[PDB]
């Protein structure tokens, strides 16, 4: 089968400040059951990642040679990597997660019936039949414990039918007789050609027999590499005796920890050993395309995020409910506005609140998008889909429906309850304008929080930007008294465009005076008797170009921010 | 030493829907080294909690008898409980955490020098000298690994000099030769009278010798209880043989898992065993005050939260910085307001924004308070302090300084930059009013989010309430057109009181007309020529009672909400 091999592996990590993890490991793997066993945080996951082509190639001083020839281009297609920290999506069922992996990472012509057959096979083999359709962990719903979740994580890669396999701590938290079941499964599979590579913590001596090739790492340096049955012989020759300890693994790990630095002494002793010579001799003897179409990747990512949204209420149902309640409350407060000395303040207040609420709502959904960062990274480097597919899928999942909906709710209730402009064109223009401001706010939210780690800083920055934009809306300050050298910032406010468009189609045919015919017989200034005078004092144009110009400014903002978000994703250091 | 004993322990957990965890355990502990070893999620933490008096006594059908006499009142004073999930505060150093525990849970007359001596002793013994003053984990700052963190958690109770000790999975993630160090320490201590009780996952056969009394739990039922050296004899008699397996613990746990339900068969076999008779025979043979003063508990909790705030920037430094920047920006935008046709809109906008920003800021700090819920619960049931002490400590830590500060910043910048009322009394009234609204918003935040689990729902509810309150502020809707049967809600708005008080001392001596002397020669209505006419149209009283009444309404809201928060804490199911 696959014969991975490496030569002079080294690595460095930037703390301008740099360190070395993994100092100079020289070794060969083989088809069968290979292993990496060493002290925690000594270089176990690091080496596994480096072998899996999952770290930035600005540190692997050295190489990797599959069967001699360099890493084939489909290497990430032909191998599975079981992560160490359970990147399984919490709001789905187990069977749906496995369906997801099977649908994306397998062939196309395979009938769905056979995919389900394989899924049931994995479900039985991993010991998951009871929780097969249960719900994985969530903050609201307590879910299956680590055992079932980790077995889910392992199944997600086991379903891929890989010809190479990688695992990082496959049994951490698995119960003693379920870890044994897992490893007996692995050993049974590792007799058909699959080259298994994994780390492990304190295996049982029964497990220890199953191994073929063993590798000890402690503080980067390679300590031993050879068959597990001769690990004992090596240490026995180098002045140690087995019989005192009964589980070889503990004898090995105690030797490392002292049961003039020792680690270097062990390293320089190994480099003097015959195994090293055999390693060097054979080593010198020896010397992206995705599976399924774009439409399919789009379909399946969109469906998964549909399921996630329906499963998560605090961003989907909570928003709709608070929107309905606010619509009703506002319909009650300002009910039946009067064309009177109060109508101007009332109308400006209503329009400003609708606009600013449409703006500030978008933060919740972008938080739900941000928390997917690590999951997305792991799914990408594992070769699921293209970046563009993930992007458009998330768009059609959340940004399209959950933001198009509240605007319809708000207009359909408020508009006729509050007695705004009574024609139809004004109704639909209000509806469309609210849609536009919602989408633009979402786009800015994405472009700010596309590629960020922590959700609290993203939220803080987003709220700061939105506050700065709404300060320029036009209600809080009369825009014609802002100084000359600061007015230019008025063009950068989404609420400005939205609120301006809303006022322009509302105030246009209005007059707020006791009797319009003979209220001008005493034509005092500072009167605002007609609506248009109020519109002018706020600095707004009157020909339809004012309204449509606001709309096109909003559309341009949408497109620009979406492209910026896509670029921040594409160039992100996806490692 | 202490001889805990129990009889007919049972428990139930409400899923109106109920289950049984821990079915009918009957057993004795003794001074020395006792243990609980059984399959994961089979009843190991549950029993330990029940013995530790840490579950609601609506399920312990049965009893616990220390040396025969019932549980003494200082039982939570004389025992330490090492939790399973690392409730150590992430933003402190290790030595400061241990100082905290030593200062609260030990005597008073002990000189601080000796407390530090004990701390160094524990630091050496637990293997923590290197990270003794490092920083525990944080999102912003990567921190010491679980090994060091778990040793910190264990030290926090080991410093108490307890005459009884409890541990739940003391070694999960500890390195093989550090787990061995921990357990050799425990065994060495368990020869001086301390009655150690702990669970464990897959101990080594070397460790297995150290035990004195063993206890196997699998699906609630008691499987075996007797010395670890005769556990083998029991199973050997009941048709099993040891030699096939080399680590007794794995032989035991494999027997449970099948290496006609078996679990009940084992239970009914045990109840027929001689050990059961000895247990029954001896069992039938056998048959809160805090340490330090209030001032001291207050001092130390306040100091710890001081350290936490300084260590956390996103709620302490970020707020001050954004406040300064907003102060400068607002000072620039409205610079030098004019008593002119725009002054009314400008002034109302500035005052409304200041008020609503003071209101909406309080959410961050209350989030930081909410995330302390589980930590507070664990520290209370462990007998650190009184509830009132924790409450007043958190108040003097966060609510006092971090909310008193921004108001001073805002007034000192904005007030003179924007040319508001130019006397001093108005300056200080604005300052005091902003302080009051800040405190009232914080109080409502606490009373809403005192005793809540998830931070996202608390934030959502809080923002909904704040939005509903500001809708009634007076800028967005003219309060005299709200219907009769909804006006009463105007008294429930903090922004209403704050904004009203701010407008009342500002608009009072003002007139917004071209030339005041002969602008009334054309006395048209809908003019708002003087400020007071604007004040009246908004429905505000003019005698000083308007201003002071707003202040007293705010003070009453503060007191009411603080008492409500304290009651929600006190009656909380602190188990
Ligand atoms: N990205 C990183 N940043 C900072 N330090 C790192 C980074 N990667 C490794 N290190 C450091 O290198 C040392 C070894 O890390 P390593 O990844 O090999 O532990 P590990 O293999 O994952 O052990 P385990 O699998 O049990 O968790 C660690 O002490 C760690 O501090
Ligand atoms: N408060 C509870 N609510 C619901 N179920 C519970 C509760 N306490 C226990 N259980 C149930 O009882 C079973 C056993 O729980 P238990 O506490 O004994 O696991 P455990 O001892 O803590 O195992 P481990 O220590 O490794 O975590 C679990 O399956 C759990 O679902
Ligand atoms: C019902 C209306 C009037 C309440 C106002 C909206 C807020 C307060 C309500 C509306 C719907 C509610 C949510 C409905 C469903 C769930 C799922 C549950 O497992 C946890 C609570 C949670 C997340 C609720 C939290 C509170 C919530 C968001
Ligand atoms: C990176 C982000 C913030 C880029 C900001 C670009 C925005 C502000 C740009 C994109 C298109 C631009 C608009 C293009 C056309 C018009 C119509 C014109 O008669 C007035 C200016 C106006 C309305 C522009 C204002 C600025 C504008 C809206
Ligand atoms: C638009 C303007 C005002 C944005 C203001 C952002 C400033 C005030 C905020 C944004 C993100 C914040 C940073 C977030 C994380 C860290 C890392 C930590 O180890 C030190 C504090 C530090 C560096 C914070 C300091 C305050 C900070 C820089
Ligand atoms: C739990 C929450 C909603 C408590 C609500 C309490 C509020 C509404 C209470 C607390 C203090 C009260 C105020 C105390 C004093 C005055 C001054 C008086 O000349 C008019 C009534 C007025 C203004 C009261 C109105 C009601 C009031 C504001
Ligand atoms: C209340 C409001 C939503 C949120 C408000 C807000 C929220 C945070 C804030 O500052 S912040 O520190 O929380 O970042 C300031 C403001 C000022 C006005 C703004 C709106 C007026 C109408 C509206 O619906």
Coordinates of C-alpha atoms in Angstrom, one line a residue, chain B residues 129-465:
Chain B
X129 CA 7.0 25.7 40.2
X130 CA 7.7 26.8 36.6
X131 CA 4.1 28.1 36.0
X132 CA 3.8 29.4 39.5
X133 CA 3.3 33.0 38.4
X134 CA 2.2 32.4 34.8
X135 CA -1.2 33.2 33.5
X136 CA -4.0 30.7 33.4
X137 CA -6.0 30.3 30.1
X138 CA -7.6 33.2 28.4
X139 CA -9.2 33.7 24.9
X140 CA -6.9 36.8 24.2
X141 CA -3.8 35.2 25.9
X142 CA -3.1 31.5 25.3
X143 CA -2.5 29.9 28.7
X144 CA -1.0 27.0 30.7
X145 CA -2.2 23.5 29.6
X146 CA -4.8 21.4 31.5
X147 CA -2.1 19.5 33.3
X148 CA -1.0 22.8 35.0
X149 CA -4.6 24.0 35.2
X150 CA -5.9 20.8 36.9
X151 CA -3.0 20.8 39.3
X152 CA -4.0 24.4 40.1
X153 CA -7.6 23.3 40.7
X154 CA -6.4 20.5 43.0
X155 CA -4.0 22.8 44.9
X156 CA -6.9 25.3 45.5
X157 CA -8.5 22.7 47.8
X158 CA -5.2 21.1 49.0
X159 CA -4.3 24.4 50.6
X160 CA -7.2 24.2 52.9
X161 CA -5.6 21.6 55.2
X162 CA -8.8 19.5 55.2
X163 CA -9.5 16.6 57.5
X164 CA -11.6 15.0 54.7
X165 CA -10.9 15.2 51.0
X166 CA -12.9 14.6 47.8
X167 CA -11.7 14.4 44.2
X168 CA -13.5 13.7 40.9
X169 CA -11.1 12.4 38.3
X170 CA -8.0 13.9 39.8
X171 CA -6.0 12.7 36.8
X172 CA -7.6 13.4 33.5
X173 CA -5.1 14.9 31.1
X174 CA -2.2 14.7 33.7
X175 CA 0.9 13.3 32.2
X176 CA 1.7 9.7 33.1
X177 CA 4.6 10.6 35.4
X178 CA 2.7 13.6 36.8
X179 CA -0.4 11.6 37.5
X180 CA 1.9 9.2 39.3
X181 CA 3.4 12.1 41.3
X182 CA 0.0 13.3 42.2
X183 CA -1.2 9.9 43.4
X184 CA 2.0 9.2 45.4
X185 CA 1.4 12.6 47.1
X186 CA -2.1 11.6 47.8
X187 CA -1.2 8.2 49.2
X188 CA 1.5 9.8 51.4
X189 CA -1.0 12.3 52.7
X190 CA -3.6 9.5 53.3
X191 CA -1.5 8.0 56.1
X192 CA -2.0 10.9 58.4
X193 CA -5.7 10.6 58.9
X194 CA -7.1 12.4 55.9
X195 CA -9.9 10.3 54.4
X196 CA -9.5 10.6 50.7
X197 CA -12.4 9.7 48.4
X198 CA -11.9 9.9 44.6
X199 CA -12.9 8.5 41.3
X200 CA -10.3 7.4 38.7
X201 CA -10.1 6.3 35.0
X202 CA -7.9 3.4 34.1
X203 CA -5.3 3.5 36.9
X204 CA -2.0 1.7 36.5
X205 CA -1.4 -1.5 38.4
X206 CA 1.3 0.3 40.4
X207 CA -1.3 2.8 41.5
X208 CA -3.8 0.0 42.1
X209 CA -1.7 -1.4 45.0
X210 CA -1.9 1.9 46.9
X211 CA -5.7 1.7 47.4
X212 CA -7.4 0.5 50.5
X213 CA -11.1 0.4 49.8
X214 CA -12.5 -0.1 46.3
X215 CA -16.0 0.5 45.0
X216 CA -17.4 -0.4 41.6
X217 CA -20.4 1.4 40.2
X218 CA -22.1 0.5 36.9
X219 CA -25.6 1.9 36.0
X220 CA -26.3 3.0 39.5
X221 CA -26.1 -0.4 41.2
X222 CA -23.3 -1.2 43.5
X223 CA -21.1 -3.9 42.0
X224 CA -18.4 -4.5 44.6
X225 CA -17.2 -2.8 47.8
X226 CA -14.2 -4.1 49.6
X227 CA -10.4 -3.8 49.7
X228 CA -8.7 -3.7 46.3
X229 CA -6.5 -6.7 47.2
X230 CA -9.6 -8.9 47.6
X231 CA -11.4 -7.5 44.6
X232 CA -9.5 -10.1 42.6
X233 CA -10.6 -12.8 45.1
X234 CA -14.2 -11.9 44.7
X235 CA -14.2 -12.0 40.9
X236 CA -12.0 -15.2 40.9
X237 CA -14.6 -16.9 43.1
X238 CA -17.5 -15.7 40.9
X239 CA -16.2 -17.6 37.9
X240 CA -13.5 -15.4 36.5
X241 CA -9.7 -15.6 36.2
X242 CA -7.2 -12.8 36.5
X243 CA -4.1 -14.0 34.6
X244 CA -5.4 -13.3 31.1
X245 CA -5.5 -9.5 31.9
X246 CA -2.5 -7.8 33.5
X247 CA -4.0 -4.6 34.8
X248 CA -6.8 -5.5 37.2
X249 CA -8.8 -2.4 36.4
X250 CA -9.3 -3.4 32.8
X251 CA -10.3 -6.9 33.9
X252 CA -13.0 -5.4 36.2
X253 CA -14.3 -2.9 33.6
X254 CA -14.3 -5.6 30.8
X255 CA -16.3 -7.9 33.0
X256 CA -19.0 -5.2 33.2
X257 CA -19.1 -4.7 29.4
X258 CA -19.4 -8.4 28.5
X259 CA -15.6 -9.0 28.3
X260 CA -31.2 -11.1 30.3
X261 CA -29.2 -8.0 31.3
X262 CA -25.8 -8.5 32.9
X263 CA -25.7 -5.5 35.2
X264 CA -28.6 -6.6 37.3
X265 CA -27.1 -10.1 37.5
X266 CA -23.9 -8.7 38.9
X267 CA -25.9 -6.6 41.4
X268 CA -28.0 -9.4 42.7
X269 CA -24.8 -11.6 42.9
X270 CA -23.1 -8.9 45.1
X271 CA -26.1 -8.6 47.4
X272 CA -25.7 -12.3 48.1
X273 CA -22.0 -11.9 49.0
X274 CA -20.4 -11.9 52.4
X275 CA -19.1 -8.3 51.9
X276 CA -22.7 -7.2 51.8
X277 CA -23.4 -8.9 55.1
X278 CA -20.4 -7.2 56.7
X279 CA -21.6 -3.9 55.3
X280 CA -25.1 -4.3 56.7
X281 CA -23.8 -5.5 60.1
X282 CA -21.3 -2.6 60.7
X283 CA -23.8 -0.1 59.3
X284 CA -26.5 -1.0 61.8
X285 CA -23.8 -1.2 64.5
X286 CA -22.9 2.4 64.0
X287 CA -26.4 3.8 64.6
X288 CA -23.7 27.4 58.1
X289 CA -20.8 29.1 59.9
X290 CA -18.2 30.8 57.9
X291 CA -14.6 31.4 58.9
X292 CA -13.7 35.0 58.3
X293 CA -15.6 38.3 58.9
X294 CA -17.7 40.2 56.4
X295 CA -15.3 43.0 55.8
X296 CA -12.6 40.5 54.8
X297 CA -14.8 38.5 52.4
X298 CA -15.8 41.8 50.9
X299 CA -12.2 43.0 50.5
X300 CA -10.9 39.9 48.9
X301 CA -13.8 39.4 46.4
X302 CA -13.5 43.0 45.4
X303 CA -9.8 42.7 44.9
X304 CA -10.1 39.6 42.8
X305 CA -12.7 41.3 40.5
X306 CA -10.4 44.3 40.3
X307 CA -7.7 42.0 39.0
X308 CA -10.1 40.4 36.6
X309 CA -11.3 43.7 35.2
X310 CA -7.8 45.1 34.7
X311 CA -6.9 41.8 33.0
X312 CA -9.9 41.8 30.7
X313 CA -9.6 44.7 28.2
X314 CA -12.7 44.3 26.1
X315 CA -15.0 45.5 28.8
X316 CA -12.7 47.9 30.7
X317 CA -10.2 49.6 28.3
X318 CA -12.3 49.2 25.2
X319 CA -15.2 51.0 26.8
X320 CA -13.1 53.9 28.0
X321 CA -11.4 54.3 24.6
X322 CA -14.6 54.2 22.6
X323 CA -16.1 56.7 25.0
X324 CA -13.2 59.1 24.5
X325 CA -13.4 58.8 20.8
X326 CA -17.1 59.3 20.7
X327 CA -16.7 62.3 23.0
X328 CA -14.2 63.8 20.5
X329 CA -16.3 63.0 17.5
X330 CA -19.5 64.6 18.9
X331 CA -17.5 67.6 20.0
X332 CA -16.4 68.0 16.4
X333 CA -19.8 67.3 14.7
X334 CA -22.0 69.8 16.5
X335 CA -19.2 72.2 17.3
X336 CA -20.5 75.6 18.6
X337 CA -24.2 75.1 18.3
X338 CA -26.2 78.2 17.1
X339 CA -29.3 79.6 18.6
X340 CA -31.0 79.4 15.3
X341 CA -33.5 77.5 13.2
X342 CA -31.3 74.4 13.6
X343 CA -30.5 74.7 17.3
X344 CA -33.6 72.8 18.4
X345 CA -32.9 69.7 16.3
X346 CA -29.2 69.8 17.1
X347 CA -29.7 70.0 20.8
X348 CA -32.4 67.3 21.0
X349 CA -30.2 65.0 18.9
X350 CA -27.1 65.5 21.1
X351 CA -29.0 64.9 24.3
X352 CA -30.8 61.9 23.0
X353 CA -27.6 60.3 21.8
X354 CA -25.8 60.9 25.1
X355 CA -28.6 59.4 27.0
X356 CA -29.2 56.3 24.9
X357 CA -25.4 55.6 24.7
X358 CA -25.2 55.7 28.4
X359 CA -28.1 53.2 28.5
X360 CA -26.9 50.7 26.0
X361 CA -23.3 50.5 27.3
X362 CA -24.2 48.5 30.4
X363 CA -24.8 45.2 28.6
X364 CA -21.1 44.4 28.3
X365 CA -20.3 44.5 32.0
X366 CA -23.4 42.5 32.9
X367 CA -22.3 39.8 30.4
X368 CA -19.0 39.7 32.2
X369 CA -20.9 39.3 35.4
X370 CA -23.2 36.6 34.0
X371 CA -20.3 34.4 32.9
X372 CA -19.4 34.1 36.6
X373 CA -22.5 32.1 37.4
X374 CA -21.1 28.6 37.7
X375 CA -17.9 29.8 39.4
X376 CA -20.0 31.7 42.0
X377 CA -22.2 28.6 42.6
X378 CA -19.2 26.3 43.1
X379 CA -17.5 28.8 45.4
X380 CA -20.7 29.2 47.5
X381 CA -21.6 25.6 48.0
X382 CA -18.0 25.1 49.0
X383 CA -18.4 27.5 51.9
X384 CA -16.3 30.5 50.9
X385 CA -18.4 33.5 51.8
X386 CA -22.0 34.7 52.2
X387 CA -24.1 35.8 49.2
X388 CA -24.4 39.4 50.4
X389 CA -20.6 39.6 50.5
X390 CA -20.2 38.3 46.9
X391 CA -22.9 40.8 45.8
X392 CA -21.4 43.9 47.4
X393 CA -18.0 42.9 46.2
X394 CA -19.1 42.7 42.6
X395 CA -20.8 46.0 43.0
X396 CA -17.7 47.9 44.3
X397 CA -15.6 46.0 41.7
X398 CA -17.4 46.8 38.5
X399 CA -20.6 48.8 39.0
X400 CA -19.1 51.6 40.9
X401 CA -15.9 52.8 39.0
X402 CA -16.4 51.6 35.5
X403 CA -19.8 53.3 35.2
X404 CA -19.0 56.4 37.2
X405 CA -16.1 57.2 34.9
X406 CA -17.6 57.6 31.3
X407 CA -20.1 60.2 32.4
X408 CA -17.3 62.5 33.6
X409 CA -15.4 62.0 30.3
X410 CA -18.5 62.8 28.2
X411 CA -19.5 65.9 30.0
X412 CA -15.9 67.3 30.4
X413 CA -15.4 67.1 26.6
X414 CA -18.8 67.5 24.9
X415 CA -20.2 70.2 27.3
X416 CA -17.8 72.9 26.5
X417 CA -17.1 71.8 22.9
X418 CA -20.8 72.1 21.9
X419 CA -21.6 75.4 23.7
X420 CA -24.5 74.1 25.9
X421 CA -25.8 76.1 28.8
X422 CA -22.6 78.1 29.9
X423 CA -23.0 78.1 33.7
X424 CA -21.5 75.7 36.1
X425 CA -24.6 74.4 37.8
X426 CA -25.8 73.1 34.4
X427 CA -22.5 71.4 33.9
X428 CA -22.7 69.5 37.1
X429 CA -26.3 68.6 36.7
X430 CA -25.6 67.1 33.3
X431 CA -22.7 65.1 34.9
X432 CA -24.9 63.9 37.8
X433 CA -27.8 63.0 35.5
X434 CA -25.6 60.9 33.2
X435 CA -24.2 59.1 36.2
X436 CA -27.7 58.4 37.3
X437 CA -28.9 57.0 34.0
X438 CA -25.7 54.8 33.8
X439 CA -26.3 53.4 37.2
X440 CA -30.0 52.7 36.5
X441 CA -29.3 51.0 33.3
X442 CA -26.7 48.8 35.1
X443 CA -29.2 48.0 37.8
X444 CA -31.8 46.9 35.3
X445 CA -29.2 44.8 33.5
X446 CA -28.3 43.0 36.7
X447 CA -31.9 42.5 37.8
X448 CA -32.6 40.9 34.4
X449 CA -29.5 38.8 34.3
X450 CA -29.0 37.7 37.9
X451 CA -29.2 34.0 37.9
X452 CA -29.3 33.1 34.2
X453 CA -27.3 30.4 32.5
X454 CA -26.8 31.4 28.8
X455 CA -25.4 34.8 27.9
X456 CA -27.0 35.0 24.5
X457 CA -30.6 34.9 25.8
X458 CA -29.7 37.4 28.6
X459 CA -28.3 39.8 26.0
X460 CA -31.3 39.4 23.8
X461 CA -33.8 40.1 26.5
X462 CA -31.8 43.0 27.8
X463 CA -31.6 44.7 24.4
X464 CA -35.3 44.1 23.8
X465 CA -36.2 45.8 27.0

